[PDB]
Ligand binder design. Structure first.
Ligand code: CLA
Ligand code: CLA
Ligand code: CLA
Ligand code: CLA
Ligand code: CLA
Ligand code: CLA
Ligand code: CLA
Ligand code: CLA
Ligand code: CLA
Ligand SMILES: CC1=C(C#C/C(C)=C/C=C/C(C)=C/C=C/C=C(C)/C=C/C=C(C)/C=C/[C@@]23O[C@]2(C)C[C@@H](O)CC3(C)C)C(C)(C)C[C@H](O)C1
Lengths: 65, 165, 163, 35, 163
């Protein structure tokens, strides 16, 4: 296997193939984040669908500036 | 057990600790802790939304005329019932997942802080008990004042002096 | 640790957040000297806030006379030119780090009787001065940003017999 | 805070309630007949 | 001593007043650090003087916008509010004393070959940079106190193709 300067520079970034943390761990954070993302997506979808109306938001072509 | 904070020391004029099995004492401690936690949460949940309504942040017609925190009962009954049902289901999970004598201990042990020293742990237990004791009286005071006067807490304070702004 | 000057009585060892757990003796010295310097600064600053409302000096700090200057508190910084503030800051810092002035052998006094108690009293007074400086700064900023945010007047409130 | 927002949050609460009821049933029945 | 980096060629060991006669190594280290810091400051300051006469950013710095408003000369001190200068000074001092940012593992690799002959070049460039300010400052102060002392204009003189 040929060795190059860039290879030696980037070698540490690829050296831990297979390393894991034993048994669950940060999974509940992942679940909570996924739930919050789902809520956010539902909010924006219902705003765009006009099924959720809030003050000072008008879903129509805007004069802009 | 761990109470009797130096301010007044041990307090039991009724002497309920004399005729009580140790299991009864543990149950009393658990009941006190649960009532304290719920009281703290309720006090915060009365303090914050009333201020939000006072500032007008949540639009107009948030908590009806006389915008107290009790107007949610008669402006949103279905939603209140759903909240109570969710709480009941979660506490049913707590009941079926926990044995007697450990009902106040959530087996978190890896997500919080939990200071290492045992003396600091006892001090933290005392602090939790004390803030819960204060909140238990605060909740009842808020309920009684709101039911008697039919006005918000801060509105009453501004009405009857006390505060300057 | 838990064996060092600072414990008074009502609270004893006050380390609720466990700041002094995984440290050696050299870091606690830095903590203590920072606490002492902040406290001494607050002790000076409470009087420096109280006193300029009864009398002023006879200077002129350049074109704008120091007496009857901007309104005492946070508004007074803008009136003084930045170059003079830099001069004073650097003079202070030279005196602090280099030890020029201040450290006088006539200073270190008596020290014959109680020593472990006077330092504790000084620390307690400094902590109280720290808290007093917070509120004082809070009141100044709140009233300066918006006039009448809180229904109070007389900057140094609580002492109406002065101003 | 219009009526739409209140109904949206109430719907979220109702969905959470339904999911909790289902999960409770599964947990109880699983623990009963362990094996 | 008489054996330390700093001697180049044209004159050699320049100590006519004999400052380092009854001096040990620690004070020599302190003096070396002082020279290096003053020289680096001058090296940055000459560039800081020359650059803003042509291009500058649109920073706000409070209501006193810096977009072609604050003069490049030494008069810039009074234009900027004193509190902003104090915050800048405090941040720079935190970097100065506690090494925040600054020293880094990607900080300064190279250094594999020429090591002694780079520090000397840095020192000489810094010395000429220190001679620069003296005149640039002296020039700016003399032309600011009352214009007309020297028969010229255009701050930096000797570079007509700038302004
Ligand atoms: C229902 C709430 C509740 C419960 C279960 C307890 C339980 C306990 N407290 Mg406690 N406490 C409470 C509320 C409560 N407290 C409140 C609100 C305060 C004031 C903020 C205190 C202040 C307090 C102090 C200062 C001390 C205790 C202590 C104790 C323990 C020993 C007391 C004993 O023998 O039995 C307590 C009695 C019972 C478990 C039976 C229930 C009492 C009757 C049946 C309820 C009647 C309430 C009555 C209507 C008052 C209404 C108030 C009004 C504002 C509405 C015990 C674990 C002591 C301790 O352990 O420290 C060493 C102690 O020193 N408590
Ligand atoms: C125990 C105390 C308590 C109680 C009973 C309430 C009760 C209420 N609050 Mg309130 N609140 C509290 C504390 C409390 N609050 C605190 C501490 C604060 C400060 C942040 C607030 C701030 C606040 C605001 C700002 C508002 C309310 C509002 C409300 C009302 C509707 C809230 C709602 O539907 O939320 C929904 C319920 C929840 C979000 C609870 C969490 C639900 C969990 C996450 C579900 C778990 C997931 C699910 C079970 C997964 C299933 C899996 C299965 C296997 C289990 C209701 C009357 C609203 C109102 O109009 O009334 C005034 C409102 O606008 N509250
Ligand atoms: C920047 C301000 C500052 C700094 C650096 C410190 C630093 C310190 N304080 Mg301290 N303190 C402060 C503000 C400060 N305090 C204020 C404002 C109060 C008043 C609430 C106190 C009240 C206080 C008490 C009551 C005690 C300390 C103690 C300590 C020491 C150990 C605790 C620790 O490191 O955490 C440490 C030298 C403890 C000590 O002396 O450690 C032995 C101790 O008992 N402090
Ligand atoms: C040029 C002047 C100068 C110089 C060189 C020094 C040098 C030193 N001071 Mg110092 N000091 C000065 C002026 C100066 N001081 C003035 C004028 C005051 C009073 C306001 C203080 C108050 C002071 C305290 C209370 C402490 C020091 C400490 C220190 C030492 C280490 C901390 C450090 O380098 O700063 C590092 C700087 C920072 C980490 C910045 C902290 C962030 C602050 C809060 C920013 C505040 C910005 C604010 C908006 C502007 C304030 C304006 C006005 C209020 C003055 C060091 C020997 C410390 C020490 O010796 O023990 C460790 C210490 O505890 N000084
Ligand atoms: C001999 C030492 C020395 C010298 C030559 C200067 C020189 C100067 N000081 Mg000065 N100063 C010094 C020591 C010195 N300072 C010390 C020890 C404290 C101060 C505090 C101070 C303040 C508070 C102010 C000056 C200002 C000034 C400038 C104009 C003075 C004026 O007209 O008013 C001038 C560059 C003024 C300035 O910023 O310049 C416009 C100003 O307001 N100085
Ligand atoms: C703030 C400015 C500053 C400071 C603190 C020093 C301080 C010092 N210089 Mg120096 N120097 C300066 C400006 C300065 N110089 C300038 C502007 C030049 C260019 C003209 C030189 C050129 C110079 C040379 C050529 C040498 C020194 C050397 C020295 C050190 C030994 C001489 C002595 O005892 O005095 C001494 C610590 C000597 C040295 O580094 O010691 C071996 C040395 O050989 N200096
Ligand atoms: C001793 C060094 C030094 C000092 C004290 C200043 C001070 C100042 N510069 Mg400046 N500058 C410097 C070096 C320096 N500069 C260098 C080396 C360059 C070239 C990259 C510039 C390029 C520059 C521009 C383009 C502008 C300023 C501006 C300013 C003024 C307001 C902005 C500010 O806070 O600084 C700016 C802070 C830096 C540039 C950080 C430099 C620190 C290095 C990277 C380490 C202020 C008087 C502004 C101004 O008022 O224009 C008239 C402006 O628009 N500077
Ligand atoms: C969270 C940290 C923090 C906070 C709260 C502030 C807050 C402030 N800074 Mg500030 N600053 C910071 C970090 C911070 N700074 C850092 C890291 C560098 C600076 C550099 C800086 C400058 C150069 C100036 C401010 C100024 C100000 C004030 C007016 C800001 C404005 O309206 O525009 C305000 C008190 C300005 C000021 O003094 O207002 C008069 C000003 O000129 N800051
Ligand atoms: C919080 C701020 C702060 C702190 C704690 C430090 C800390 C340190 N600096 Mg430092 N420095 C800072 C900000 C800071 N720096 C800034 C902002 C600058 C650039 C303007 C410098 C420029 C600088 C140099 C050039 C040198 C240091 C040195 C030192 C070290 C010892 C000297 C000392 O502590 O002050 C001691 C302070 C004095 C002795 C005061 C001297 C009197 C001054 C020069 C009068 C100036 C008056 C003038 C009118 C003000 C102009 C303001 C404005 C126009 C710039 C120490 C690590 C020295 C070092 O490491 O070697 C010894 C060193 O040679 N610093
Ligand atoms: C914020 C607020 C207020 C407030 C407040 C408060 C509490 C302010 C804080 C007050 C407080 C706590 C002030 C302590 C001072 C300690 C002093 C002065 C001691 C100095 C002693 C010194 C300087 C000793 C000097 C020595 O030289 C001696 C003598 C011998 C020498 O050899 C050695 C030394 C150098 C040691 C209002 C305004 C009251 C009302 C308002 O509503 C709310």
């Amino acid at each position: 296997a040929l060795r190059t300067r860039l290879g030696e520079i980037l070698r540490p970034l690829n050296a831990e193939y297979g390393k894991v943390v034993p048994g669950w761990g940060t999974t509940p954070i992942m679940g909570l984040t996924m739930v919050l993302f789902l809520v956010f997506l539902l909010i924006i979808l219902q705003i765009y669908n006009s099924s959720l109306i809030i003050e000072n938001v008008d879903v129509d072509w805007a004069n802009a500036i | 057990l761990v109470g009797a904070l130096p301010p007044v020391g041990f307090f039991d004029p009724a002497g309920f600790a004399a005729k009580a099995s140790p299991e009864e004492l543990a149950r009393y401690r658990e009941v006190e802790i649960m009532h304290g936690r719920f009281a703290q949460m309720a006090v915060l949940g009365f303090i914050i939304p009333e201020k939000c309504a006072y500032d007008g942040a949540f639009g107009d017609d948030f908590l009806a005329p006389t915008g107290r925190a009790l107007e949610a009962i008669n402006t949103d009954p279905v939603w209140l019932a759903l909240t109570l049902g969710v709480i009941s289901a979660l506490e049913t999970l707590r009941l079926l997942q926990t044995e007697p004598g450990t009902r106040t201990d959530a087996k978190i042990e890896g997500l919080g802080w939990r200071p290492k020293s045992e003396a600091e742990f006892v001090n933290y237990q005392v602090r939790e008990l004390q803030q819960g004791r204060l909140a238990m009286l605060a909740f009842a005071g808020e309920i009684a004042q709101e039911l008697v006067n039919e006005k918000p807490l801060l509105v009453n304070l501004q009405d009857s002096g006390f505060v300057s702004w | 640790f838990e064996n060092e000057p600072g414990v008074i009585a009502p609270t004893g060892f006050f380390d609720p957040l466990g700041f002094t757990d995984d440290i050696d003796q050299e870091k606690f010295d830095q903590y203590r000297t920072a606490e002492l310097k902040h406290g001494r600064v607050a002790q000076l600053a409470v009087i420096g806030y109280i006193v300029p409302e009864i009398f002023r000096w006879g200077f002129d700090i350049a074109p704008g006379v120091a007496c009857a200057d901007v309104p005492n508190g946070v508004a007074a910084i803008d009136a003084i030119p930045a170059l003079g503030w830099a001069q004073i800051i650097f003079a202070i810092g030279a005196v602090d780090v280099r030890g020029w002035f201040g450290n006088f052998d006539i200073g270190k006094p008596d020290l014959k009787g109680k020593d472990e108690e006077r330092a504790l009293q000084e620390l307690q007074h400094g902590r109280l001065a720290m808290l007093a400086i917070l509120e004082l700064l809070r009141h100044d900023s709140q009233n300066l940003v918006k006039p009448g945010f809180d229904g109070l007047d007389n900057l140094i409130t609580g002492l109406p017999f002065l101003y | 805070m219009t009526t739409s927002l209140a109904n949206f949050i109430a719907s979220l609460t109702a969905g959470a309630l339904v999911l909790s009821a289902i999960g409770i049933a599964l947990i109880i029945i699983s623990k009963n007949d362990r094996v």
